[PDB]
Amino acid sequence: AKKALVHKANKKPKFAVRAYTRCNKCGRPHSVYRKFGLCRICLREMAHAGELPGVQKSSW
Amino acid sequence: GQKIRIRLKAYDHEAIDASARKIVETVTRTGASVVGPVPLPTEKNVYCVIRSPHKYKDSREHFEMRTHKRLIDILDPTPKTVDALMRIDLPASVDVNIQ
Amino acid sequence: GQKINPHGFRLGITTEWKSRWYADKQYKDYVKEDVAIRKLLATGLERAGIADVEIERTRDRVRVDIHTARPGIVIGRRGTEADRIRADLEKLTGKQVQLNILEVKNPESQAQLVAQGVAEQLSNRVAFRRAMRKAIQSAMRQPNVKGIRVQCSGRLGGAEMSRSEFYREGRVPLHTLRADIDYGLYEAKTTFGRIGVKVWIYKGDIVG
Amino acid sequence: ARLVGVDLPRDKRMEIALTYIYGIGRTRSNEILAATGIDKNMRTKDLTDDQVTVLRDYIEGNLKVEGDLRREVQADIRRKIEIGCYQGLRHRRGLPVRGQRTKTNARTRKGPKRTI
Amino acid sequence: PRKGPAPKRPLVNDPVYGSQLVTQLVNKVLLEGKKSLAERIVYGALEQAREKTGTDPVVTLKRALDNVKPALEVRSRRVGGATYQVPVEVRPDRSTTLALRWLVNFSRQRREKTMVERLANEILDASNGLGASVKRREDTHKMAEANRAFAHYRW
Amino acid sequence: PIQTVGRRKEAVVRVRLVPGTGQFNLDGRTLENYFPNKVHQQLIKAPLVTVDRVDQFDIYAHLDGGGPSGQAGALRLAIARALILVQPEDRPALKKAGFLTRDPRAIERKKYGLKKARKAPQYSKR
RNA sequence: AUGUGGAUUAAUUCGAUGCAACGCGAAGAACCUUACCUGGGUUUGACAUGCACAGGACGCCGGCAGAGAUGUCGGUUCCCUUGU
RNA sequence: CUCAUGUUGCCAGCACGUUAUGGUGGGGACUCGUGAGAGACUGCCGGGGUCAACUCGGAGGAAGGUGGGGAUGACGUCAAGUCAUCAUGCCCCUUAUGUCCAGGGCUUCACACAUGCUACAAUGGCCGGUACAAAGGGCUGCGAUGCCGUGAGGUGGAGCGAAUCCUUUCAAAGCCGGUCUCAGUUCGGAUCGGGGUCUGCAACUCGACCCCGUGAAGUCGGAGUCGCUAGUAAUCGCAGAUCAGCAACGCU
Numbered sequence A: 001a002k003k004a005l006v007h008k009a010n011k012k013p014k015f016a017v018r019a020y021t022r023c024n025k026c027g028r029p030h031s032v033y034r035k036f037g038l039c040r041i042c043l044r045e046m047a048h049a050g051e052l053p054g055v056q057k058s059s060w
Numbered sequence B: 001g002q003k004i005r006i007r008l009k010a011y012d013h014e015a016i017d018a019s020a021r022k023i024v025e026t027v028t029r030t031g032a033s034v035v036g037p038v039p040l041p042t043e044k045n046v047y048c049v050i051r052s053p054h055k056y057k058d059s060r061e062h063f064e065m066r067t068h069k070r071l072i073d074i075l076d077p078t079p080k081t082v083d084a085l086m087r088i089d090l091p092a093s094v095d096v097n098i099q
Numbered sequence C: 001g002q003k004i005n006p007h008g009f010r011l012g013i014t015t016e017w018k019s020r021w022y023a024d025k026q027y028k029d030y031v032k033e034d035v036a037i038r039k040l041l042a043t044g045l046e047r048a049g050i051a052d053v054e055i056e057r058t059r060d061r062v063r064v065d066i067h068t069a070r071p072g073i074v075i076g077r078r079g080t081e082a083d084r085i086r087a088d089l090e091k092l093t094g095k096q097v098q099l100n101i102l103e104v105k106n107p108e109s110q111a112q113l114v115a116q117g118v119a120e121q122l123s124n125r126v127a128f129r130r131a132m133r134k135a136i137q138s139a140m141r142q143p144n145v146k147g148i149r150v151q152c153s154g155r156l157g158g159a160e161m162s163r164s165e166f167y168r169e170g171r172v173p174l175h176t177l178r179a180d181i182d183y184g185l186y187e188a189k190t191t192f193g194r195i196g197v198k199v200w201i202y203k204g205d206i207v208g
Numbered sequence D: 001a002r003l004v005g006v007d008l009p010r011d012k013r014m015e016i017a018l019t020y021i022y023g024i025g026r027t028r029s030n031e032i033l034a035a036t037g038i039d040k041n042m043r044t045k046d047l048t049d050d051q052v053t054v055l056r057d058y059i060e061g062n063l064k065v066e067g068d069l070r071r072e073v074q075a076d077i078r079r080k081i082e083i084g085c086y087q088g089l090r091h092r093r094g095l096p097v098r099g100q101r102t103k104t105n106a107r108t109r110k111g112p113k114r115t116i
Numbered sequence E: 001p002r003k004g005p006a007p008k009r010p011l012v013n014d015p016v017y018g019s020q021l022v023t024q025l026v027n028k029v030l031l032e033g034k035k036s037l038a039e040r041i042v043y044g045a046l047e048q049a050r051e052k053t054g055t056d057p058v059v060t061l062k063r064a065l066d067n068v069k070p071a072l073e074v075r076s077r078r079v080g081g082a083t084y085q086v087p088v089e090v091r092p093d094r095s096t097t098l099a100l101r102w103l104v105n106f107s108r109q110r111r112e113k114t115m116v117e118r119l120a121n122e123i124l125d126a127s128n129g130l131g132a133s134v135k136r137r138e139d140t141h142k143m144a145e146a147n148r149a150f151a152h153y154r155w
Numbered sequence F: 001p002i003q004t005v006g007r008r009k010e011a012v013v014r015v016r017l018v019p020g021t022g023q024f025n026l027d028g029r030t031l032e033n034y035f036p037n038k039v040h041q042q043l044i045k046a047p048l049v050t051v052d053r054v055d056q057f058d059i060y061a062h063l064d065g066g067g068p069s070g071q072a073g074a075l076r077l078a079i080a081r082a083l084i085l086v087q088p089e090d091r092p093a094l095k096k097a098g099f100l101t102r103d104p105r106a107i108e109r110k111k112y113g114l115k116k117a118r119k120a121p122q123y124s125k126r
Numbered sequence G: 001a002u003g004u005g006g007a008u009u010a011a012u013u014c015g016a017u018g019c020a021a022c023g024c025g026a027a028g029a030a031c032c033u034u035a036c037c038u039g040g041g042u043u044u045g046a047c048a049u050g051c052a053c054a055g056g057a058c059g060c061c062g063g064c065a066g067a068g069a070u071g072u073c074g075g076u077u078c079c080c081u082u083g084u
Numbered sequence H: 001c002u003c004a005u006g007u008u009g010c011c012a013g014c015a016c017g018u019u020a021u022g023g024u025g026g027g028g029a030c031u032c033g034u035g036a037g038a039g040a041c042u043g044c045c046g047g048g049g050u051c052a053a054c055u056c057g058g059a060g061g062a063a064g065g066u067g068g069g070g071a072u073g074a075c076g077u078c079a080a081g082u083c084a085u086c087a088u089g090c091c092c093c094u095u096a097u098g099u100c101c102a103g104g105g106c107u108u109c110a111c112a113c114a115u116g117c118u119a120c121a122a123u124g125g126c127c128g129g130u131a132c133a134a135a136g137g138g139c140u141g142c143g144a145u146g147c148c149g150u151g152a153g154g155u156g157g158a159g160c161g162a163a164u165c166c167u168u169u170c171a172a173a174g175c176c177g178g179u180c181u182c183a184g185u186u187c188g189g190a191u192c193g194g195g196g197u198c199u200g201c202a203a204c205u206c207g208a209c210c211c212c213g214u215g216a217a218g219u220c221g222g223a224g225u226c227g228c229u230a231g232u233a234a235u236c237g238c239a240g241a242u243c244a245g246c247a248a249c250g251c252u
């Protein structure tokens, strides 16, 4: 993720259309989830770190 | 007849039980009608994730958003009771919604 | 992949959670601030081993608990690093916050502490054999831990090739969820590149 | 039967018989039957010539069908192919203009499966 | 099946008549899991046959089952570079199973515009010996009884 | 007051009995007008004929979960259980019939990497 | 309907190829995502840190010229204190 | 199964409802909701078993012998994949291989392979009537009743950060009646013409959806090849999610 692209994304768009997540920790165009505000492998790593209020393994 | 609804708002079963215990003890001490911590359907969110980058989509990992809610309908809302629950401090685990 | 994270697997029954709160609309803001603070504190504090972190939050106020093997440089007797970190949090706009510092009981049985120490010795001069033997011996010395395993994978000694090796001693029921297991890791510094190390620690079991 | 150069079916539901005519589809047949008051369940064996006259009146007064549609559609197609629109370019090239998966599908406009 | 016998399901009984064979019929007529419509079609075909023949439905069905129930099947075994055809006796369960499955899978095809009438017509043909089930039993018997010899393997 | 419950494949029904006549009240509509499938009526009627005490009890049914088969089976098992609940002297016969044992099998976990249940995508080794 | 080889185009970005790639990244391409092209510039910089040389401005709201980024002109102007 | 336990959730049993229904006063007698506990441990019997492990059969019980399904990847293999998540050693550009928009391309297209949907039709299509599920999302969002529109959709906008309010009283197959009598068909849906909406600064490449015209191919499929042993196979609907729209038949 080019820092130029990250800065352009975070800067207020000239139009409301140019808005996207770009996971903040690592800025990934794809594979980002809004509710957790982080990318996909990023969320997995953070969950294995275990500092997230609610993420736990699912089985039933 | 006036009734005050208290919504208990958090994940952990142990934390919710402890919060219900503290609230019930405070109400019993203050002398107000309390039914108890009525159980509520536990909302369970599911989020699935693959375990690898760049394909291998057949393997994934799961999650839950396990939220516990309890209903405590305390009748006869004594003023001193209201101040007692307002001043009560609870662990950051559970969220208290007074309504 | 070979082994899932034992900590992540055992969050439910055995281990505990390092941050507790539950709010939805601003949850993204919560995670954003938490990640920013964690990364900047990791970048800043390197002299003192920040073993664990913990975030307790209610409404605007937030509290942080950090575990280290020694607070001598964590907090100055006057509070130099203390008010420094206070300044970092204030310009991060943490609202109401305070710092709690706790020293580990047995630093030699802590996953992050031992891994970081052995890795620092390796990055400095220590050969992997001597470093890992010291780690294993010092960890097994305490009668609290009876089964511990440590692994380091990378170009050992600067070779143009990556080894896969480890030494085990005791019992590590990874597939036993009742087992009390502590996991760690860290990305070492080397002029030739980077090397990863993973550590498994078992400390008794919980029944009930 | 016979209807505006379109052979009315000997025995079929009028909603399909009229659809047999070029310019009408099931929906328009239903609406036409409702407007003219004729039901959509009888047979052609009860057909009456006065009814045929009334359908002809209504159709010629409130619809365009057959040769007029042919000429209009051809005129529009030729106009847009003449203008140079991307629609006309696709028409000339023999490929769909809507932009579907013209690589794997579009065999309809590419003709039966021909192998290199 | 490499440890032993898999327990068989004790299917329910048809109340109106009282024959598990009819239930088996309906299960075989079951496509996409629509048992209500399957029972509807079975009733339609059986009523058609009833009004066609003036005979007890249970008696006619038993007659058809007995007429179209085989008593020997052929097994294929390859030894010495080629496959061989070898027969083996079957139980009454297998016999009725084959009979019902044939009847159904060959009433599936006829082209008189209604499978509901197809079922009854083929039941009548099986009863009177003209059924395609009768034909299939004939050809399978041809194939089997052409080879009593390969039974020496007894495999 | 006698009550019985039935849970299977998400099919759940609350069943109330009465020694009165054998009238059927399924959410206010009789059994005849409620899901008129001969197989379903057979399954509902089976337990009472098994007990051989037909037209000696009345029922009040409230159903939830599942479709027609699910509700029919849940109610059937409901009467099967309530019969023993009221009178345990028929337990040997009703257990020999197997009515008391609810069928403990329902929708299984849909596992990732599979189209549904335990089927798998079409396989090609070329 | 979309993925994949392949050919054509100024671009047809790139990665992935049997079991274990192929409605796989891509869980949404009119501008962004966009890493590729013909097409106007631009440059210690769009984007931060620190050493020097001049600044109280930076920073804020509008009009004209343009196909837009381009630059010019109008409105307000630093918080500390004599070191910054 | 026992206990605790009645509101937004239920009604045994009393009253009002009087057409709109537990709708309303009332009540845990049950599910319902989620906490604690119990229960399957060959527990007991016979046969055999080396009197040992264990098997088969029988009573009990809900299940009998890992009751069912998930998570859980042993040492290692393939220098297997991923410097385009991230970070990382070396080299390479720096007045450029950096920077912004002077728009367009990422789908283009004579052809095959990979996995699905639509069907090829009567156990069905179409037309009218008619009952049943779970789980889940909702703030610069979900979105009531109402009006205008065939229908996308517009006006207006209650209730909801939320068992409540919107996702229709969340349905489809299911059941009743009418048409179709085996047709390239009332099956069948693409392709193409003309008229609109929505998101958005602007829909030509290069979106989605609606209406009208369009009527092609196509008859269970060639060798060989996939999966499937209990709610399994098959068939139907629904929702989470990336999103502003939308190629959403995809994944879950």
Ligand SMILES: [Mg+2]
Binding pocket: A017, A018, A019, A020
């Ligand atoms: Mg966007």
Ligand SMILES: [Mg+2]
Binding pocket: A021, A022, A023, A024, A028, A031, A032, A033, A037, A038, A039, A040, A042
């Ligand atoms: Mg992200």
Ligand SMILES: [Mg+2]
Binding pocket: none
């Ligand atoms: Mg797939």
Ligand SMILES: [Mg+2]
Binding pocket: F107, F116, F117
């Ligand atoms: Mg299923």
Ligand SMILES: [Mg+2]
Binding pocket: none
């Ligand atoms: Mg595959």
Ligand SMILES: [Mg+2]
Binding pocket: G014, G015
């Ligand atoms: Mg590529």
Ligand SMILES: [Mg+2]
Binding pocket: G017, G021
């Ligand atoms: Mg390949």
Ligand SMILES: [Mg+2]
Binding pocket: G023, H116, H250
């Ligand atoms: Mg797919």
Ligand SMILES: [Mg+2]
Binding pocket: G032
């Ligand atoms: Mg852009």
Ligand SMILES: [Mg+2]
Binding pocket: H010, H011, H027
């Ligand atoms: Mg009640």
Ligand SMILES: [Mg+2]
Binding pocket: H074, H075
């Ligand atoms: Mg191994």
Ligand SMILES: [Mg+2]
Binding pocket: H079
């Ligand atoms: Mg490698």
Ligand SMILES: [Mg+2]
Binding pocket: H083
């Ligand atoms: Mg690179």
Ligand SMILES: [Mg+2]
Binding pocket: none
């Ligand atoms: Mg790098």
Ligand SMILES: [Mg+2]
Binding pocket: H083, H087, H088
């Ligand atoms: Mg790196």
Ligand SMILES: [Mg+2]
Binding pocket: G034, H105, H106
């Ligand atoms: Mg492009």
